[PDB]
Structure 1
Amino acid sequence: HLCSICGDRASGKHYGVYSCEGCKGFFKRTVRKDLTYACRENRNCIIDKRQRNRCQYCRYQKCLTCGMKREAVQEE
């Protein structure tokens, strides 16, 4: 299967949606330490298996729009 967020190879559904280790890892950390990001452009940055790390804001948002739901993330 494929990560619905970046197109990288997925290996399960994590937090509700077919996602890759990276996107899952990223989503988890974002919630766990409750981080807020800011896009240096607009809010339509590419975010794929190659550029996903160019904008934390757009990556997270895309996590949200793809179905990744919080609540599925426990803590410490």
Structure 2
Amino acid sequence: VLLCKVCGDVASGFHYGVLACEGCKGFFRRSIQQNIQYKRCLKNENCSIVRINRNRCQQCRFKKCLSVGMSRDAVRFGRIPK
């Protein structure tokens, strides 16, 4: 089926331009709205965001959402076409 582009979980839809799970849809919006910076990464700027460890590090997570393409400008309402 649908896989979340950011953590690999099951995608619940197409959100902000990329298929994503409900957890990352909310996280992203949440972040990109009521904005504020996230604590500093506790490793190298690369933490493998996965279904089980996605919440362990917000900085690399949010960074990953943008990474894959999420934004308010890539929204697509309605049915899916071709």
Question: Normalising by structure 2, what TM-score?
Answer: 0.81
Aligned to 2:45: 43
Structure 1 alignment gaps of length 5 or more: none
What is the CA distance between 1:31 and its match in structure 2?
Answer: 1.3
Count of aligned pairs = 73
> Does 2:65 align with 1:63?
yes
Aligned to 2:6: 5
Q: Which amino acid aligns with 1:52?
A: R
CA distance in 1, matches of 2:16, 2:57: 21
Deviation at 1:23, TM superposition (A): 0.3
1:6-43 Cα distance to aligned partner (Å, 9 max, x none): 00000211111000000001001101110211212121
- RMSD, aligned α-carbons: 1.5
TM-score between both structures, scaled by the size of structure 1: 0.87
Q: Percent of aligned positions with the same letter in both sequences? A: 58
**Unaligned regions of 5+ residues in structure 2, if any?**
76-82
CA distance in 2, matches of 1:13, 1:35: 25
62-71 vs 1-10, greater mean Cα deviation: 62-71
Distance in 2 (alpha carbons) for counterparts of 1:24 and 1:59: 12
Partner Cα separation in structure 1 for residue 6 and residue 57 of structure 2: 13
AA in 1 matched with 2:54: R
User: Following superposition, which runs of at least 4 residues in structure 1 exceed 3 angstroms of deviation?
Assistant: 70-73
